[PDB]
């Protein structure tokens, strides 16, 4: 979740390392859930920064 | 052409009752209402002091 | 019992009183009012008190569209959205019972109640209406749409309870009222309706009839003419700077729907960061959130607790003895500090 | 003098003109303008005049359902409620007299004027003028429901305020307005429609001048021989974001409503702790309330005073002396502790 | 590349999304989905990703009163104004586009999405909706009507835009509806509309029957006679709570609105306080505005980086001496802190 944790090897390029935690849950009880959790937005942090 | 513009600034008429005084200091007064009670004249007595 | 809360609408026809605020600015008759509170919010159910038949019809029609207020300029029959969150803001109304309204909505200190039904454009019954968060949880978040706690609260729960609690009304009260009627010249030439009007002048025998069909009192007017508009089937108690010397010194019960019950709810699992145990000391990274409290505690030792409700993304080194702590932040489990390896 | 409401309203009849925020992250020609505030009726009476008749039917009049708006493609004279005041909050609804808008509203620092009624859909125009007053007394409260107090203030003038206020024009009407505009190639088959319509051209007397009526114009035809609706029937208010292309210095003067006076009020009274007066120790136990300013003054001693606007239930800490303390805080009376045994 | 409208609304029969938070706490189906938010704006013309085609109607291109309200409560054109935004504040939508939503609203934490014509008893699906400020220039105000600066910012594009990305939704029906079905006792009897109705026999090797019409299943009916929504026509591409794991996957590509632009904003630049340089030394008296940003530099010299945020007048320490200073406070060119002689 660090600056620049969204990993972009060039900028016409496709790959890249990441460092989001794309953390899913199995889900809830009724509702089988999307429990998808990333890291919080390293965009939306280095913004804030 | 132009934007030849004037501007107007006054007194705004919310100061009709909206003034702010500044008393340069002048002399304090003293008007005494002394409870007189001289044995059976047992009264009030106000006056300059 | 309770299976005619119209009923118990019927034998207590309630009423608005003298109200502090129908705008923002007049102290006056506020006939649809906040008369009370009753919040027992373990999850943010309020039920403010009105003193119409919020939860029924003045008839007795059980719907949103009959929605009941009361005063003798009668009750008023209301569609729902004339019932009026204004909590400093349009909170989420689930409903009225009898004479409180239960709902949720934002926090705020400035409630009030909008009653609006078809009879005006709306009268506001303003009031403190200090609703606090009181939030439950390791955090700060507030919402049903992730799979992230049961919180075992309490709930003003949905039940119109036949008998729950007490809603007492009782003593019938009278209303004031020169006005209603109208003044002869030595006299009172006047019809009594809106309440039952005994009277009261300055000289004559019109000083004692109460009002149903009124007349022409001579030698004794206006100028020592009064008269007070009391009611019948008058079950109210409530009259918060109303009168009370409606004399029946008694009040019949009612129940008390909207009850408090448990109740889970869905909850903010506040996130860890970055913990990386390093050859000195563990060190935790946190991104901000809902305002949770990262929470270390002193695992085993004279314990260091610490937490701190937070929304700011910053670190802390876990102090990591070889007994260590417990870092619990924002409602995951303790972190178990043991430090070693 | 302006003490008639009639003329006085309806000789200049409403201009929507050109507000910088109207859309997304643009303005427009506005329907509904908002001119300059008046509050200092302490109650927050802010009398937002702006460019349509505050309360006036379109044909003069106060009609109670009539809001006049006009342009020169016409008068929109449509419904009461279509404009909003949502000052941060909704319609803070109090009244409105001659071109002004007068509201207790609530607080917040972007305020909008909101025109639905015959103008638009609806028109949106904000104003950064925060009402957040701190009005009188002590207390962190304001408090109308409760006679906590009848705290002496400003009465903004809600009566037929005729002449204290001169809504006026000078210079009149100054705007860009063409919309008369017709097909032609050299000779330009103009018609009837747009605007008090003159032309500004290299030609004619119409083509550079005044049409009023059907014309073909010569030696200035579209592109370069243009036209403009002057805002004309009255001294229009100054208009800003506007020019002195109208550049008849003139006068139009008018009323506005309804100066303020003095008027009590209603107010947050005195909540007191329970204070630790022991034998050589003073305390005060505040309970927590609305912030209110505690006066812990010095009681004819030295009067370094404790101030506080607090809202915490703290300790007002009664040192006292032989002198005594003055004790008052939040709008209650004051206390003469005076300490012996 | 989605230039016109009609077969990426064409083929959009849309579904409800599993949602926790609709109402009180209630969670289902809701018929307009609220799938994301996105950032495109300088100031936050904020793009929800939303549930059906956003206006996009049954009539190809969208009416404007006919917002396609898409569940199986069916693909029908509620009335489009009925379409509101809950930011915590009532939202300003400047269009609506695809399955997208794109316009301003009060920037913070509490989203919510509302169909009202059908669209809802009230419709107000929402989030803990994260959406903040963040404003360009150190003035935290938003100058609407005039404003110190007209300086370009990526912003958004307001007209949004026919396709440049794709939003390509997979894996066709699978959700909940499953109602269809019916009960006999031994032979259960077949009769639907209003979903695809995938059957399912228990006493039964034929049961699996997607439905659009009667049917049977003898020996077992339901209770053991499953029928559940299965679906084609899309990818209404990640409800969570439900099938975004269809195990089909076959996808529909549309576009996205929104180009950014460098829209020109009216900026933050207020008069500043006098320039207390003093003979020997420097200071800048400045007033207060919208929450501010002035900044000094060591100037010429090593760098003392300064700034701040501005909510009341303060007199900042000018580096007063030959060697200068930099100063830059709040959209204007700095100050080259020189003391003369």
Same mark, same amino acid.
């Given at each position: ?49 | ?19 702010? %005084? ?14 007189? %009670? ?12 | ?25 007049? +102290? ?32 007795g029609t059980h719907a949103h569209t009959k929605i009941r207020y009361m005063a003798g300029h009668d009750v008023q029959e209301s569609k729902r959205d004339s019932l009026r969150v204004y909590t400093s803001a349009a909170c989420s109304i689930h409903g009225t019972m009898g004479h409180f309204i239960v709902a949720h909505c934002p926090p705020g200190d400035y409630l009030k109640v909008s009653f609006e039904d078809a ?20 955090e700060k978040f507030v919402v049903r749409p992730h799979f992230g706690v049961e919180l075992p609260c309490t709930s003003y729960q949905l039940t119109t309870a036949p008998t729950d609690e007490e809603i007492d009304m009782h003593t019938p009260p009278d209303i004031p009222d020169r006005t209603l009627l109208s003044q002869t010249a030595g006299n009172v030439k006047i019809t009594a309706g809106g309440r039952t009007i ?59 729907? +909207? ?53 700011? +993304? ?28």
């Amino acid at each position: 979740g660090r600056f620049g944790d969204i990993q972009s090897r060039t900028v016409e390029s496709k790959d890249l390392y990441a460092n989001t935690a794309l953390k899913l849950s199995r889900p809830s009880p009724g509702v089988v859930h999307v429990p998808y959790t990333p890291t919080p937005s390293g965009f939306k942090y280095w913004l804030k920064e | 052409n132009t934007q030849l513009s004037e501007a107007y600034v006054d007194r705004s008429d919310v100061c009709k009752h909206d003034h702010a %005084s500044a008393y340069k200091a002048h002399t304090a007064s003293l008007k005494a209402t002394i409870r007189i %009670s001289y044995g059976t004249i047992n009264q009030t007595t106000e006056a300059f002091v | 019992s309770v299976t005619e809360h119209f009923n118990v609408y019927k034998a207590t026809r309630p009423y608005l009183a003298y109200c502090a605020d129908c705008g923002d600015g007049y +102290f006056c008759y506020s006939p649809v009012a906040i008369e009370k509170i009753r919040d027992e919010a373990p999850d943010g159910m309020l039920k403010i008190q009105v003193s119409a038949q919020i939860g029924l019809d003045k008839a007795g029609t059980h719907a949103h569209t009959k929605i009941r207020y009361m005063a003798g300029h009668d009750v008023q029959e209301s569609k729902r959205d004339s019932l009026r969150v204004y909590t400093s803001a349009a909170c989420s109304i689930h409903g009225t019972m009898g004479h409180f309204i239960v709902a949720h909505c934002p926090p705020g200190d400035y409630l009030k109640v909008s009653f609006e039904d078809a009879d005006s454009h709306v009268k506001a019954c303003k009031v403190q209406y200090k609703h606090d968060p009181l939030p439950v949880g390791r955090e700060k978040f507030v919402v049903r749409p992730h799979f992230g706690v049961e919180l075992p609260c309490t709930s003003y729960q949905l039940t119109t309870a036949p008998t729950d609690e007490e809603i007492d009304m009782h003593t019938p009260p009278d209303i004031p009222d020169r006005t209603l009627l109208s003044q002869t010249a030595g006299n009172v030439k006047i019809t009594a309706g809106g309440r039952t009007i005994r009277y009261n002048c300055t000289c004559g025998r019109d000083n004692v009839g109460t009002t149903s069909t009124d007349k022409t009192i001579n030698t004794c007017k206006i100028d020592q003419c009064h008269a007070a508009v009391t009611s019948h089937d008058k079950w109210q108690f409530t009259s918060p700077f109303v009168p009370r010397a409606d004399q029946t010194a008694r009040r019949g019960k009612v129940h008390v729907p +909207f009850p408090l019950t448990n109740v889970t709810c869905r909850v903010p699992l506040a996130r860890a960061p970055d913990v990386t145990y390093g050859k000195k000391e563990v060190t935790l990274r946190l991104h901000p959130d809902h305002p949770t409290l990262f929470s270390y505690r002193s695992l085993g030792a004279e314990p260091h607790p610490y937490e701190e409700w937070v929304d700011k +993304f910053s670190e802390r080194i876990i102090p990591v003895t070889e007994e260590g702590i417990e870092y619990q932040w924002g409602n995951n489990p303790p972190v178990r500090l043991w430090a070693q390896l």
